[PDB]
Design a protein around this nucleic acid. Structure first.
Ligand SMILES: *O[C@H]1[C@@H](O)[C@H](n2cnc3c(=O)[nH]c(N)nc32)O[C@@H]1COP(=O)(O)OP(=O)(O)OP(=O)(O)O
Ligand SMILES: *O[C@H]1[C@@H](O)[C@H](n2cnc3c(=O)[nH]c(N)nc32)O[C@@H]1COP(=O)(O)OP(=O)(O)OP(=O)(O)O
Ligand SMILES: [Mg+2]
Lengths: 206, 203
RNA sequence: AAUAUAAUAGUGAUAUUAUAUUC
RNA sequence: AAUAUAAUAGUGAUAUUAUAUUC
């Protein structure tokens, strides 16, 4: 199947990424939603841990800063990949999860501002997420396959393999949240269940 | 002896107590400074702020944390006033500085950062006011006189000095070795555990 | 803490991430 | 967690804080 159309979500997240990158580039001197950007941001995050000043407290604040920025950048990247392989709602839920966990741990001066900058684009992001015209063609085709196969055979035990746990939760919520897939009763199998996954069990697709 | 005749320190810190209870005076929808009466009052107030409720629970948490912090800083300021009544103003200042050091160690809270900021605004004026030799309290002067005379008559004198609080223990501990005239003294500390031939002349 | 697999840069030993497992 | 002492508030049972101790 083809990749998605146009991504408004990716545009917004990209702007946030280059803004965060601007915050990080103030101190120190390849596209978004790719594995390369992940390797890069990792090596960069490690490079900021070598940063040294005669003043150790200011150094502490700066290294903490760069760690925070690189972290949020990483999370943004992951969110983009998730939106590529799943719904936009899954990506936004990933980001919301992240920022929620950030809030629970207590707010640094900087994390509060990053959260603040996310909050203003949140309404637009959700507005894009509720837009039916933007749906993923991959999930279109998957839904089509499931529909056909369960139409021909009302009793079908399916097993769906995905790369990451994020996609497991994402596709679980996608199946539970799709009116067309209502005949499905999904279940989860991951690393650190099976008796209810049978044909007589509660789970059609695993 | 006589109480110290003029408080500059309390004059300015009553302004921080006033500004803190003014900040408290924003969120409330609702007595002398440097006394136990104010301590009782601020404790009862602190306990009164915990039972206030709102339909929004998170907002409630925010303002309750705020009120708790405000009353806490108020209490610490009061403590500083008392400490400086019974000891050097440097000791009270250092008490507050230790307090805010701990606060900084806790983490960055919007309220705490604010309060610490307003405190740091007055820090220069404050340290200006306790570095002056003119402001030394009559009680410590008289104590210094007693110790001086008694050790002049008998240099082998062993002394024991009883004070009410541990804060004052640290206070006089620093006061003795921070005093050039008392240089013959070798202070030591005796307190509780919980939250002649040797060389210690005074305990 | 160790092990395996996959993707990714490197000619390669490797390295990063993902996934899973074991002690 | 319990106990004692001191100051403060209250007519008082008490209450707050301070100090110390014990289990
Ligand atoms: O250096 C490791 C290691 O010494 C020890 N450790 C943690 N889990 C294991 C284990 O399963 N088997 C062995 N032999 N050693 C183990 O902990 C150190 C690192 O701590 P971590 O934070 O990485 O471990 P943690 O539990 O927090 O995470 P996870 O590995 O279980 O996912
Ligand atoms: O309710 C108390 C109590 O159950 C328990 N506790 C703590 N210390 C003791 C003790 O010496 N003897 C008894 N019987 N029970 C004790 O802890 C609860 C309260 O916790 P705290 O925060 O007050 O205890 P902490 O160690 O933090 O302070 P402190 O004991 O030094 O004064
Ligand atoms: Mg994924």
């Amino acid at each position: 199947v083809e990749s998605r159309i146009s991504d408004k979500f990716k545009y917004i997240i990209a702007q946030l990424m280059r803004d965060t990158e601007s915050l990080a580039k103030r101190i120190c001197k390849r596209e978004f939603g790719t594995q390369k950007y992940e390797q890069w941001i990792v090596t960069v995050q490690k490079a900021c841990m070598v940063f040294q000043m005669p003043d150790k407290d200011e150094e502490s604040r700066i290294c903490k800063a760069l760690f925070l920025y690189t972290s949020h950048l990483r999370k943004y990247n992951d969110a983009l990949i998730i939106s590529e392989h799943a719904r936009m709602k899954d990506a936004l839920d990933y980001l919301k999860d992240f920022f929620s966990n950030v809030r629970a741990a207590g707010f640094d001066e900087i994390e509060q501002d990053l959260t603040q900058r996310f909050e203003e684009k949140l309404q637009e992001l959700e507005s894009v997420s509720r837009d039916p015209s933007n749906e993923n063609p991959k999930l279109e085709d998957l839904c089509f396959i499931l529909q056909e196969e369960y139409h021909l055979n009302p009793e079908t035990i399916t097993i769906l393999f995905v790369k990451t746990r994020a996609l497991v939760d994402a596709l679980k919520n996608w199946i539970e949240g799709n009116p067309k897939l209502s005949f499905l009763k999904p279940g989860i199998l991951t690393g650190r269940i099976l008796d209810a996954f049978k044909a007589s069990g509660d789970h059609n697709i695993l | 002896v006589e109480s110290r005749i003029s408080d500059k320190f309390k004059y300015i810190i009553a302004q921080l107590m006033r500004d803190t209870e003014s900040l408290a005076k924003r969120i409330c929808k609702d007595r002398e400074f440097g006394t136990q009466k104010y301590e009782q009052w601020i404790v009862t107030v602190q306990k009164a702020c915990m039972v206030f409720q709102m339909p929004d629970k998170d907002e409630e948490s925010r303002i309750c944390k705020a009120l708790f912090l405000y009353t806490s800083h108020l209490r610490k300021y009061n403590d500083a006033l008392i400490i400086s009544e019974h000891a050097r103003m440097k000791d009270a200042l250092d008490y507050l500085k230790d307090f805010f050091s701990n606060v900084r160690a806790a983490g960055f809270d919007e309220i705490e950062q604010d309060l610490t900021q307003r405190f740091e605004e007055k820090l220069q004026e404050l340290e200006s006011v306790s570095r002056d030799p003119s402001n030394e309290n009559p009680k410590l002067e008289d104590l210094c006189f007693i110790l001086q005379e008694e050790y002049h008559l008998n240099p082998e004198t062993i002394t024991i000095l009883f004070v009410k609080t541990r804060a004052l223990v640290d206070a006089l501990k620093n006061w003795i070795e921070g005093n050039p005239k008392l240089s013959f003294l070798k202070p030591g500390i005796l307190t509780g555990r919980g939250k002649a031939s040797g060389d210690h002349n005074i305990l």
